[PDB]
Design an enzyme around this catalytic site. Sequence first.
Site, PDB file in Angstrom:
ATOM      1  N   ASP A  64     -21.237  -3.502  35.610  1.00 40.93           N
ATOM      2  CA  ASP A  64     -21.142  -4.308  34.382  1.00 40.93           C
ATOM      3  C   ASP A  64     -19.669  -4.513  34.000  1.00 40.93           C
ATOM      4  O   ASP A  64     -18.908  -3.561  34.090  1.00 40.93           O
ATOM      5  CB  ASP A  64     -21.933  -3.704  33.236  1.00 40.93           C
ATOM      6  CG  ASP A  64     -21.752  -2.224  33.103  1.00 40.93           C
ATOM      7  OD1 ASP A  64     -21.440  -1.547  34.101  1.00 40.93           O
ATOM      8  OD2 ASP A  64     -21.948  -1.743  31.975  1.00 40.93           O
ATOM      9  N   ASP A  84     -27.510  -1.661  29.604  1.00 37.85           N
ATOM     10  CA  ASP A  84     -27.965  -3.055  29.774  1.00 37.85           C
ATOM     11  C   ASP A  84     -28.287  -3.357  31.231  1.00 37.85           C
ATOM     12  O   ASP A  84     -27.757  -4.304  31.817  1.00 37.85           O
ATOM     13  CB  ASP A  84     -26.946  -4.076  29.257  1.00 37.85           C
ATOM     14  CG  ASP A  84     -27.534  -5.514  29.179  1.00 37.85           C
ATOM     15  OD1 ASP A  84     -28.786  -5.678  29.130  1.00 37.85           O
ATOM     16  OD2 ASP A  84     -26.746  -6.487  29.160  1.00 37.85           O
ATOM     17  N   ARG A 141     -28.995  -9.761  35.991  1.00 39.07           N
ATOM     18  CA  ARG A 141     -27.678 -10.346  35.715  1.00 39.07           C
ATOM     19  C   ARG A 141     -26.525  -9.363  36.007  1.00 39.07           C
ATOM     20  O   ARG A 141     -25.412  -9.792  36.347  1.00 39.07           O
ATOM     21  CB  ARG A 141     -27.641 -10.839  34.237  1.00 39.07           C
ATOM     22  CG  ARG A 141     -26.406 -10.485  33.369  1.00 39.07           C
ATOM     23  CD  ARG A 141     -25.383 -11.599  33.473  1.00 39.07           C
ATOM     24  NE  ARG A 141     -24.211 -11.424  32.625  1.00 39.07           N
ATOM     25  CZ  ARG A 141     -23.253 -10.531  32.843  1.00 39.07           C
ATOM     26  NH1 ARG A 141     -23.328  -9.720  33.885  1.00 39.07           N
ATOM     27  NH2 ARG A 141     -22.222 -10.441  32.013  1.00 39.07           N
ATOM     28  N   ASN A 142     -26.800  -8.062  35.901  1.00 44.54           N
ATOM     29  CA  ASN A 142     -25.790  -6.997  36.074  1.00 44.54           C
ATOM     30  C   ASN A 142     -25.907  -6.230  37.386  1.00 44.54           C
ATOM     31  O   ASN A 142     -25.358  -5.131  37.544  1.00 44.54           O
ATOM     32  CB  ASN A 142     -25.868  -5.972  34.927  1.00 44.54           C
ATOM     33  CG  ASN A 142     -25.309  -6.505  33.627  1.00 44.54           C
ATOM     34  OD1 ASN A 142     -24.300  -7.211  33.625  1.00 44.54           O
ATOM     35  ND2 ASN A 142     -25.968  -6.175  32.503  1.00 44.54           N
TER      36      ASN A 142
HETATM   37  C1  LIG Z   1     -13.800  -6.487  38.167  1.00 41.50           C
HETATM   38  C2  LIG Z   1     -14.859  -5.520  37.732  1.00 41.50           C
HETATM   39  C3  LIG Z   1     -14.503  -4.490  36.867  1.00 41.50           C
HETATM   40  C4  LIG Z   1     -15.451  -3.586  36.448  1.00 41.50           C
HETATM   41  C5  LIG Z   1     -16.739  -3.733  36.917  1.00 41.50           C
HETATM   42  C6  LIG Z   1     -17.837  -2.795  36.527  1.00 41.50           C
HETATM   43  O1  LIG Z   1     -18.907  -3.153  37.014  1.00 41.50           O
HETATM   44  N1  LIG Z   1     -17.535  -1.616  35.678  1.00 41.50           N
HETATM   45  C7  LIG Z   1     -18.517  -0.627  35.201  1.00 41.50           C
HETATM   46  C8  LIG Z   1     -18.431  -0.138  33.901  1.00 41.50           C
HETATM   47  C9  LIG Z   1     -19.348   0.783  33.397  1.00 41.50           C
HETATM   48  C10 LIG Z   1     -20.376   1.228  34.178  1.00 41.50           C
HETATM   49  C11 LIG Z   1     -21.315   2.239  33.541  1.00 41.50           C
HETATM   50  N2  LIG Z   1     -21.228   2.275  32.110  1.00 41.50           N
HETATM   51  C12 LIG Z   1     -22.133   1.312  31.501  1.00 41.50           C
HETATM   52  C13 LIG Z   1     -21.994   1.273  30.027  1.00 41.50           C
HETATM   53  N3  LIG Z   1     -22.315   2.585  29.566  1.00 41.50           N
HETATM   54  C14 LIG Z   1     -22.763   2.706  28.219  1.00 41.50           C
HETATM   55  C15 LIG Z   1     -21.472   3.672  30.067  1.00 41.50           C
HETATM   56  C16 LIG Z   1     -21.205   3.634  31.563  1.00 41.50           C
HETATM   57  C17 LIG Z   1     -20.504   0.759  35.504  1.00 41.50           C
HETATM   58  C18 LIG Z   1     -21.640   1.248  36.353  1.00 41.50           C
HETATM   59  F1  LIG Z   1     -21.696   0.525  37.479  1.00 41.50           F
HETATM   60  F2  LIG Z   1     -21.455   2.541  36.604  1.00 41.50           F
HETATM   61  F3  LIG Z   1     -22.779   1.108  35.707  1.00 41.50           F
HETATM   62  C19 LIG Z   1     -19.580  -0.177  36.024  1.00 41.50           C
HETATM   63  C20 LIG Z   1     -17.137  -4.750  37.785  1.00 41.50           C
HETATM   64  C21 LIG Z   1     -16.177  -5.656  38.190  1.00 41.50           C
HETATM   65  C22 LIG Z   1     -16.635  -6.742  39.113  1.00 41.50           C
HETATM   66  C23 LIG Z   1     -17.053  -7.575  39.889  1.00 41.50           C
HETATM   67  C24 LIG Z   1     -17.577  -8.535  40.905  1.00 41.50           C
HETATM   68  C25 LIG Z   1     -17.511  -8.348  42.280  1.00 41.50           C
HETATM   69  N4  LIG Z   1     -18.056  -9.403  42.860  1.00 41.50           N
HETATM   70  C26 LIG Z   1     -18.470 -10.261  41.948  1.00 41.50           C
HETATM   71  C27 LIG Z   1     -19.109 -11.500  42.056  1.00 41.50           C
HETATM   72  C28 LIG Z   1     -19.426 -12.176  40.894  1.00 41.50           C
HETATM   73  C29 LIG Z   1     -19.123 -11.643  39.674  1.00 41.50           C
HETATM   74  N5  LIG Z   1     -18.513 -10.453  39.570  1.00 41.50           N
HETATM   75  N6  LIG Z   1     -18.180  -9.745  40.700  1.00 41.50           N
END
Ligand SMILES: Cc1ccc(C(=O)Nc2ccc(CN3CCN(C)CC3)c(C(F)(F)F)c2)cc1C#Cc1cnc2cccnn12
Length: 297
Positions: free
Chosen positions: A177, A159, A163-164
């Site tokens: 995300d 996705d 937004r992400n």
């Molecule tokens: C607390 C938190 C926990 C986790 C994550 C997170 O992003 N986890 C993540 C999960 C999966 C994937 C890749 N997959 C996608 C799906 N897929 C099918 C498999 C692999 C990735 C990726 F970046 F690698 F893509 C990241 C972000 C935050 C945040 C925050 C934050 C910091 N500042 C602000 C300001 C405003 C709002 N939010 N915020």
Amino acid sequence: LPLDPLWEFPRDRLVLGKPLGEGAFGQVVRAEAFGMDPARPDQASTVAVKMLKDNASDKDLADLVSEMEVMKLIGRHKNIINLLGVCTQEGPLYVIVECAAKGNLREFLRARRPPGPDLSPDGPRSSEGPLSFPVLVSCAYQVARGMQYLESRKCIHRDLAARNVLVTEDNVMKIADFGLARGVHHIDYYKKTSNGRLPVKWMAPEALFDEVYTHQSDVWSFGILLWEIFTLGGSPYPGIPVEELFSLLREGHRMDRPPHCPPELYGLMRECWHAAPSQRPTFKQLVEALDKVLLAV
Ligand SMILES: Cc1ccc(C(=O)Nc2ccc(CN3CCN(C)CC3)c(C(F)(F)F)c2)cc1C#Cc1cnc2cccnn12
């Protein structure tokens, strides 16, 4: 949950603050951390903390643990939201990541649109908005760099959308995300979010119609994200409801060229939306193409 000394962080070194959002996949809160760098144990920093909602089930917990494990494996990159630590012992599960002070890329752009002709001229820069072409191109380039890194770690986002993508205090783009165990076998295609988003409008055709996701499916979404950037946070397929989107995608409809967008960039968009996934650019090629534009400007 077992103790992983590499990533474990004492929960009493966190002070939880304002919620940043809730979703299907938990809840995210701003927090202050003390001693995230073990060399400076009393130093404060601002982080973001993911945790379970109030009445969460086993699947919800398994989903968050799954997210934690994926983030451990991914490693660090400038253009992804990086894992900082976890709290797994003696209390609720916390996944601690970088905080991006300026919020998500969609809201970042929408808040920075140029002044409209309703303006009364005041001073020597009445016509100059905060956003300039090279900085928009740099936003796209950074997202492409992060996606190229994610692809190299065999990670499909599924996705990718403005937004992400999160924006740091130094205007660095960070892919996030805001999802992970995305439940691709039970997507409500008609779902509209509280901010009016229709996430089906970012899905590649092979994902939507055939439930197939590859890195080239993320390349399609990147094209949609490029359109978002160069409309300064516009909503894709303007005025088209989901029912009509289905039939238009079957006829091969593509979005028009947006105003004030050079042909180089609409060119890239249309390449990303080629019907055959193998005829879309790779993220490596998108990085190179955007680099060339960045250098020229
Ligand atoms: C607390 C938190 C926990 C986790 C994550 C997170 O992003 N986890 C993540 C999960 C999966 C994937 C890749 N997959 C996608 C799906 N897929 C099918 C498999 C692999 C990735 C990726 F970046 F690698 F893509 C990241 C972000 C935050 C945040 C925050 C934050 C910091 N500042 C602000 C300001 C405003 C709002 N939010 N915020």
